[model samples]
Target chain A: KAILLFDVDGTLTPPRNPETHDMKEALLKARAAGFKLGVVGGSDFAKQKEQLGESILEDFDYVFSENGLLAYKDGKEFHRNSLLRALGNEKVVAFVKKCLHLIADLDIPVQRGTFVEFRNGMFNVSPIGRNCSQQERDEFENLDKERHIREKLIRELKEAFPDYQLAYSVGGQISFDVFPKGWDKTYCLQFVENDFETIHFFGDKTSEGGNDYEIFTDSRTIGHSVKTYKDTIAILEALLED
Target chain B: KAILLFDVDGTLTPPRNPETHDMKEALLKARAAGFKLGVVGGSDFAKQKEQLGESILEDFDYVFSENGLLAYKDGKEFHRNSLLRALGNEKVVAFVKKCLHLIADLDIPVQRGTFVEFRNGMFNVSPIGRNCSQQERDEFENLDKERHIREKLIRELKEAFPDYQLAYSVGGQISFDVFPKGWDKTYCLQFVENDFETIHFFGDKTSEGGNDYEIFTDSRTIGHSVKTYKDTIAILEALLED
Candidate 1:
């Protein structure tokens, strides 16, 4: 009966400015109140760790990264159905290379990101590459210029590469997350719920085109929307008080 | 000669990854080759700048951000007639504050990104806040969630805030973006085209709930699909080499 979930971005930190220390005290205070906290976000696990920091993240009971593509419980990585086995590293690399070649031929930029991330049987191509500075990374995260182009490319890529189920993850400037067609946040949520009886979700984005949008919109979960990092703590306090 | 216009994210970056270096490069190259480049994005000029970075953005001469609320040409910014006096600062701030209060009451995470951004004479909400962590930010970017819940929220929000027009952006995630009725991306594109002889369009999230989808499907611009960042470059090369 003590299930609580929190969304990181606008909820825990301010939007765009992750370094802003807006809600640290609120979060720690919530932990003291004896509530099991879980973070559900669109970033990969490592990135989530970086954003929340080990000190804060360690206090949480669980972490759901890549929109639940990766889950960690008691600081241990959890796998669902060997999802990574489905995406053989060699095959993913080959697909990325092919995608790169196709983009080169088309004259589109091939933004790179944290290399191929293999998590819970999911494979993704990060947009900014691994070594970009925060400012450079921020610039790279902007998708206004290519939002439509990216969609079109995804359609074509799906058609060209039918075996892979391509989806968008809401981290960085942009990302192309690949997994089996039905392997998404919803599926992952359901999978986790199989073990846990009740799950509550808190997130800033639960709208169309968003990765966590689906998870938040799920029927089985109680959804909360946060607008800023500081808001995360306020909401947590309010919820705990209730 | 048919000048093909393209949006970067959906058109080239692929739905999986919204921002990528290759896609940015491709857009620059495409503009360099003298193909009419027009961008219709849901973000504001500041967001566009933040997303594309200076080096990549210098490529384009015309840009439409805030889903047509604002326009940029030759580094100068312009606002659409409807956007120029849509919501005053007091009203906007008040309304946003109300939303924040509602979010707090509901314990929903509120993120502030370029969404509901305030520019010269324009303001918009990106649905997902601008500075969310990679994980939380990503969750806020998905579009598909519980249809009924989102619809209910939109209906309630619209009913409660009749003055503000709520809409959705195409690719990143699903959240509510606000604008005046009839002031969508397509309308904005048309408004900007009055000054130019020919305008081509590019976008990634031009489907169903995507902001650019309306423009792409509506035939407002010469749309090209971008599957990946590199794909954008390939299209540019094809155009330039010819």
Candidate 2:
């Protein structure tokens, strides 16, 4: 069976908003048209549940949360991986502490709380902190563009942990994600690569250094770059016609 | 009418947990005794809703979230104050930036995200980050007891912003709050001071540097220092007999 995989944040739903009924209906059409509906998101399963709705597992045949570090098929979890499992707790602790020091060393206009978020597969590093209000987030986003705060942090982290083989991808408004080199969205492709004859992946962040870059550019799947869920719905409608 | 005022955490509800039906019923008894029931919490209104339940406004005659920076009476918001309004954004930005620098300078075992949470009336500074799991919170709490990490941070903040007139209070497991000098739990007392002939304040954190210290020590309130919600219930039950 062929599969239609989507990036959750921008492709299937508006960024920071839930899926629209129109988009939900479009996915239903895709599923009815014989394409196995799948979703791969950077956030953990709990966050994904909020965006995609509680019937997420029921709505999609495959759910790849945390870029498939945690995977589900037919409403049941099939695979899981942990950063602690990949890197020992000692190394993880050391890495987090070093990151904290680096964050403290930076001179930024303002900082809010939740600078480093540890996830199942990655660490979300934010200079202004993830606890910032939406207004604060906008202010920090503007400041970051002018000062290259996140870019500088990423550069410093690379230099600090050269041997860690960590990959950094700037995403969302406030933070960049850091994870092991092979743990991008492409990680989920391996699960369905042999099972599906063709896979169609749709995502907004398809450019280089974007979170979806690896999976969207991978040779194993067909990629459709979309700027918003509207683009995704249109693309899915057109694809369904064929 | 006299008021039976309570602290939300460790008093009306278990620390970091929601109110139990047993505790909720006990408050009903106080209300039946012709006493106005009220609650003051350090967290925002949203969090109080989670802890106290969706019908929080209806349950309490007076609800003071953010230590009464945002207040509600008879299920309607009556008063509000903001840190940004008090100190302006420029000062707040500077303070938060300094906080980030201080956090960066500190050497800790592991630092998660949400180091400095900007609340409506205060800044919640957590050395280990507020986004940690319960286990991580426990680890940091134990480490804090040994190394006095939060104490040291509070000291540095006090020195860095001496003119800020901000008072520091250590609460919960991971964070300390920074607010204006008179913005402690006592901030809510002004609203109910004359309205009630006697205002009884119940809290676990009644020690000198605790969040409840000011309100507990205030001459306007009759303070009931409790160790937990069980103690609060017992105190309330005993007070009912009188």
Candidate 3:
């Protein structure tokens, strides 16, 4: 009847995460009660599995990978709208990618894959080490806040690709996904295709470049930014109850 | 520890179909016995939920949708690489889309959605009626086959594009996904990322225009084309038995 979309990291679980039993049960319950549930995240498939296990694939109707460039349904591809395509032309992909290589040269050596991933929609820049422990995650988050490592990167990258069609944001944590101006998670809406009357979007990373910002800011959908899956549960239940 | 990918349509269940209790049971059994599972399909985020339900999402470890453009893990996005982004540049996207509109005037009255979907990598064209029943699905298959409707369209599209990189195949019953000369399901391997020793791919449609052709032909992946999910279950059982 209604579509419920969520972000995996922060919203459903923290960055170094798992579907705590209650959270898993909550999702199952929500779907059983007739919610067309799906999630959009910045990680790639293997990394998501490394974090969530195979069962993660079975919990939602659709999972938006690479920030909605791809949507998987029941362990199969249901849709794909490359950020390269979403941004209008392929040369644009070249320019954005140029920024990726450009960003790698930052005074701080860059990490490929997530540090500046090719999420197809936006060039997702997650400074979190590809393989990090809980302590590392926390330390890095705080450090980014104080050092503004991500903040500076965003400013620098924004200037390199000066096309106004492109707007960069902090997608999640110390990360950002850049796309042609105004193209962000909201591009995911095209995939929604009127299946649900009211869309309740739950995300923990709504602040720009944190991954959930587009849907969080979109006027068409009701968005909630939660700190963790536990809080998301409380908010999710209330939204579902109504 | 190896990653196993699957095809949803006939291999997992069937085209334009649902997840059967047996299909669900078999999948759960595989994972319980310790198997990392994933899938690839050609549906969108909402449509997949509509057909398979959220449980479908929880079955596999990762899901590749939109013909390798996207993959999901634990109800979250793990990876996405659009084919539109795969080609050397964006002009290819524009040119392919043009062929899509050109194909629109082909032998049959077109239904834009599935009939002509832009899957980033290819202009996926499924000449299927929005509300066709079992009989209709069968008749359309024959009509297209006998009329060489797909073949004609492919030939015409090829001539117009005239670019060697351009490639199109019948991806499903009455559909096709267009991509650069040598890209298809194999593109999904990026997410697998050396996780698997033996890559087993299954599908009901891989014959030329049937979606699995490229992967089936790719020596890297051991591909099996089945008659239906019934056969798939047998194969899946044997494979899981190991």
Candidate 4:
């Protein structure tokens, strides 16, 4: 038996956009052909369900979400990393309040999105005005700036607090992520791999610094880089055929 | 008054973890200095509110969460770029269900977390499974196998569906993301910046392939990459002191 892992973004869907009809059909066919499939992505569970749809989920036996912070099995929720929950609601609230004041002091326009996300044990603070237009997105791209200010901010933050983890995700714009130290996609994968003989990964952004880069660099798992969702079916066929 | 933008996770708290004492102090000082405060994070609005606590959120004029998918002003909820809303719940549900079955046939370990997230007309698939032990996490890190699995999955899905918008993000672990074209952090930032004179972004992971890579490489807004929550205050001191 062969287990096929798929990436939801560009691999299962169209490039830089939503999923198309063709991609959906291919996925259906792969399932009928007896391919055990799963998706590894950077999106939270809520977002993941939105893309795959309920029908597809029923077909797949397993899934890994939030870089493997939280896990669900047979409709049961499991948390791989409980750090987010460990922080507790009170701590998260306090942290946000304090951080806001700092932003105000900087006199910098700070955008907000997903103020707080509780996925099992992991928590997050996604900053970027949600649902911005393409034009607005262009400006936020920092086309008119000098030096990567976001990088500088991370460096400064790391210097101040060395215990935490920070991640930058592509959120239809820009989003900053915070997690426990050594908690990332790669870390999460390690946690899950112990139970399975082989782990497979699929993703769109696997380049350097990309959210999926860590997993791409891993050698234990099979990696499949996709530019469009249509590719998911093709890859799955190859994996199962092999 | 200076408009200070702060990140919650790493900037105001520890990296990839939770909030800390130092982060709280930094916010207090920044606020005492009379700065217009705001928080930009990847968490949802409710989660953001909980993370910062009412006391802290009260201090800020606005809050952005869900990677700029949700916005809060004076305690009012405003959804921006709701891709899931655009996709509609029924449609998204149907699509996800189909994908689930495909995943099951692959015989790979499956995990689920959260629910389908609809924001700014986008969709995603989040799955989670068992956690790896410390040793496993370390070993997996050395090999970097998760990316390969994700990429392979993506290729299969894309081939099946040629028109879906799929992307990758950095959640606590790994998950899949499906959204409209051109939806990302940079785009979200631009949407928020249109109303502001100078927009400043604070994030931790701004490297290539990381979720925030696009915003880091593209945004023209004021950028401040933070690695820890405590750094927010320091950044304010350095940039606002003048």
Candidate 5:
């Protein structure tokens, strides 16, 4: 009757890396506690699998990728929403064109091959460029916070395209997720069949534009804001003790 | 029960200007023919009113502004959706921050006061700085088309925030509307009582990344691709014979 939902990037792994031993250990214990655990992340299914590992599918009751645009349970992909498909070819083309337009400026702070990634369900316009090395990603993330480059772009994109119904999540230090309205981790709530009151969401970007904002607003669930994966591990440990 | 919807700016009025007598006569005649007439433009409620006049709402069964983020019928605002409110304060702040970041780049073709406008349902990330005189607007629009400055911004914005589900329309030579996915004129479908098959949309920016792209793909309406207000006038004339 209880569901535990988590955000990936900042909440689980550190910004651009994968699950650590401590983070993974906390999750394994949470799984042992019999909570219906799941992860809803902004990246694609394959990327989530890569970061969390293929074993992740069996570890959680459900796995959400592309911010719950795609969902899987019991080793089967049971849910899928074609935001890009629904957006159709024209807008998709436009979305890419606009991205390519923005890609030029992104080169200053960071740049690399495949600057724009169409994850089918969402777009990850990386300020630091997805192709960057781990060291570069770490460096860019730190510099970006002060330059506020990604945040600045989020604001510009919103102001520049009011006809597009969308929202933002600075899910990482180097990248952000541009998903449909309310597509943040709250959308993962659909996979959660438990009584809303019995669910808990642990997230990092729980601020106003953070990906976790929607789930926090829902009275049906308990929301915890975590800053680092270390913070998330502490919560998982605490939740398991209950 | 045919409903004819139109885009302003390039579809009805010249960019950054008001309606002309010729365009009004075409619309009035279309209205006389008993086809329900409406407008779905990229401007805000006030600017749409200013460009089309107080009588504009009465002239159409439904009038949409800010790319349908806000709408009205019978001279009252019956429906409104706040894009920034929908986007939340954080993104709104980010949207502005990016505008400020890009504001430096936008000053090339022209400069005006209040380069960025936070219309309730949309944002006008203006290249001409929204504070220009008619002459300055005219001058800047001419130069911008050659420089493709706004187009450049579109590309840059898209690259920076790929996860942000937003789209662009260089609606006017002066500014573009940044709204949610499909917030374009297709959003006007909500107010229309007709079948999707029976609705007709006339717009200029139907190309990829154009403001009118989404509406062109809707099954509920027949999308008419127009190059200018002149092309739209010709379409209205041809439809009248039927």
Candidate 6:
């Protein structure tokens, strides 16, 4: 059977926000036509749930969070991965200490808390701190654009840990993600590659250096890139008809 | 009307887990008998919801998360206090840096992620890292009992930030909380004091130096100390009859 895969932020919903009813309805319609529905996001399942809905698993055939490092099929957990387990305690500690120290020295306008978040499959490094207010997030984003704060940090991190083979892709507003090489959104493709004859992928960040670039450009799928959830719905409607 | 206040972890639920159906039934019975139910916890409202169920605000007459630094009366937020807002950006940054440095220097068996969790009213410091697996948590707890790891960190933090006027209280398996001196479980009492003539408080940690010590020992509250949720249900059963 054919399957439709989606990126959570910007593609399925607004950035760092909840999904709209229109988008949900469109997804439901798409599923009703016998297309197996799936979602793959860099965020953990908890975050995906927050942005989507609590009944996210029931709503989708496949829920691939942390780019399917933590995967679920029809509400049952099918696969799980851990950065800590893979890297070992010593390496993880060393990496975190450097990141924390780098965060500590950065002279920022507002630093709240949760500077370095350890997730199941990735580490989210936010200099502005994940605990910052929305206003602070916006302020930092503007400042980052002007000053290239995250860009500089990512460069230094890559330089310091050249052997780590980590991908430091900037996503959302306040943070960049750190995951092992080849563990981006494309990582989820492996699980579904053999299952479906026809695969369709939708994402906002499909350009070079974007998180979704590899999977979007993969040989096995027809990729549709959109700027917003409205754009997603618009394209989905046409796809459904065709 | 009388109000019954409960501590979330260990009292209303198993430690770091969801509440039992028996506990839920007991609370429902108490509310039916004309006693207003309330839950006060050192954890943020989100963690409270995780342990007590999502409809926690509706379940209790008063929902006091983070020692009522974030409070809701009958599901409507009445009060909100933030450590970041109170302490300002500079002091918070300094404190976090010191804690991160200490955590980095410590010779710990496992250090995962989320070393410093910034909540609305407090900073949760875990040297072993909050992202450790359940087995890792148990292992670290056993090691901590022998080495007093958290105690030493608390002492060093106090020494470093003597003038910050923060109280460091160890709770749960892996973390100690740091908040303003007066912002403990007693902080919730101020909101309920004028409204209720008879206030009955139940908690697991009512002994000296415990997070619940202040509010439990307060003259305004007739405190009942229990070892577990079952103990709470036993006392609650007796209190219902009397």
Reference contacts preserved by each model: 0.00, 0.56, 0.00, 0.02, 0.00, 0.53
Q: State the lDDT of candidate 6 residue by residue for B22-135, as single tens digits.
A: 999999999999999999987788889999998888899899988898899978999998898789888998898888778878887777778888877888899877777899
Which 10-residue window in model 6 chain A sums to the lowest lDDT? Answer: A107-116
lDDT per residue for candidate 1 within B69-166, as digits (tens), equals 66766667665544325654345445544443333233234332222333333333333334334675455444335333344445656678775664
Worst 10 residues of 6 chain B by lDDT: B104-113
Error of 3 at A41 (Å): 41
- Candidate that beats the other on lDDT, 4 or 5, i.e. the better one: 5
The 10-residue segment with the lowest total lDDT in model 1 chain B: B107-116
Off by over 4 Å in 6: A1-65, A70-80, A188-204, A219-222, A226-242, B1-65, B70-79, B188-204, B219-242
Per-model TM against the reference? 0.40, 0.78, 0.40, 0.43, 0.40, 0.74
lDDT of 2 at A155: 90
Query: Per-residue lDDT of A1-242 in model 4, one digit per residue for the tens?
Result: 44556666776776545566776666667667765566667677777777777655565656667766666654556556565355654454344443333222332243322223444444333323333345645665663244344454445555654544444333334445556655556755654565666667777777886766777668866777776665666776676576
Most accurate candidate by DockQ = 6
Candidate 3 wrongly placed segments (more than 4 Å): A1-242, B83-121, B124-153, B156-164, B170-177, B240-242
Tens digit of per-residue lDDT, candidate 5, span A1-242: 77788888888888878888888888788777777788888678888877787798887788888767889887678888866555654554455445545644453533433344555666667654554567868888888877888888888888776678877767666787776786766777766755434888888878786658888777767889988999988877777776
For candidate 4, write residues B68-102 as lDDT tens digits: 67665555656565654555544444444434334
Per-candidate Cα lDDT values, in order, are 0.55, 0.86, 0.64, 0.55, 0.73, 0.89
Candidate number achieving the greatest lDDT relative to the actual structure: 6
Instruction: Evaluate model 4: give its lDDT.
Output: 0.55
Model 2 chain A lDDT-worst window of ten: A104-113
Model 1 ranges with Cα > 4 A deviation: A16-25, A28-33, A68-70, A80-84, A89-94, A107-148, A168-179, A182-184, A187-192, A195-197, B1-242
RMSD of each: 20.7, 4.5, 16.5, 23.4, 20.6, 5.7
- Tens digits of per-residue lDDT, candidate 3, A181-210, equal 645567667777566777888888788656
All candidates: DockQ: 0.01, 0.45, 0.02, 0.02, 0.01, 0.46
lDDT of 3 by residue, B1-242 (tens): 65567777667776668878887778777777777888877665565656667765676777777755667877688766655456533454344344434443444532212234344456555544222345656676778877877777778778776754777666456666566764567778767766778777888778876668778777768888888888877877998776
Which consecutive 10 residues in model 5 chain B have the weakest lDDT in total? Answer: B105-114
For model 4, the superposed segments whose C-alpha errors exceed 4 Å read: A16-35, A80-83, A88-98, A109-140, A165-175, A187-192, B1-242
